[PDB]
Design a protein around this ligand. Structure first.
Ligand SMILES: [Ca+2]
Ligand SMILES: [Ca+2]
Ligand SMILES: [Ca+2]
Ligand SMILES: [Ca+2]
Lengths: 97, 96
């Protein structure tokens, strides 16, 4: 199914970056930065934005273990997907006026 | 990017079922049923299970407007993906 394909992909993406160092199933700041730069580059306007990454790391690491675990990563993905969905919807609503 | 491809897919799937009736951007119980049966059938052990769909509807519709909006739908997707990831990680741990 298209949905479970997407779910599989969320899992794969995470594990593509989380296994370079430290906990194999959590993202370090470095691994997160890597993932942001390669996977969400449009959100960084294809710029390097370390201070922004720092803030993303701080907002996502809710339990303060200096890692972004999978639950924490999914919080990111959910927020950015909702925001994009909302964008597309408002663009259609604006058009129908 | 693989990630943004997946995010796009989440949006497209929801909008694939949400536009049959009512709000074009929310799932009725009926629309949610169609989505669950087409997209998550393995979670239903490939059975039709309207009693479980009812409970799923009731759980996802946190604002009690009788619809599952996109945010509500992503709560389900997050929960299921997290559970699936946990499964795959515990299967690896077990193996070692
Ligand atoms: Ca790691
Ligand atoms: Ca954390
Ligand atoms: Ca609808
Ligand atoms: Ca609702």
């Amino acid at each position: 199914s298209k949905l479970e394909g997407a779910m599989d992909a969320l899992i794969t993406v995470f594990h593509n970056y989380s296994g370079s160092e430290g906990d194999k199933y959590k993202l370090s700041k470095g691994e997160l930065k890597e993932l942001l730069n390669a996977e969400l580059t449009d959100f960084l306007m294809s710029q390097k934005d370390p201070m922004l990454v720092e803030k993303i790391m701080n907002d996502l690491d809710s339990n303060k273990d200096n890692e972004v675990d999978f639950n924490e990563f999914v919080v990111l993905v959910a927020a950015l997907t909702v925001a994009c969905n909302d964008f597309f919807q408002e663009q259609q609503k604006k058009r129908s006026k």
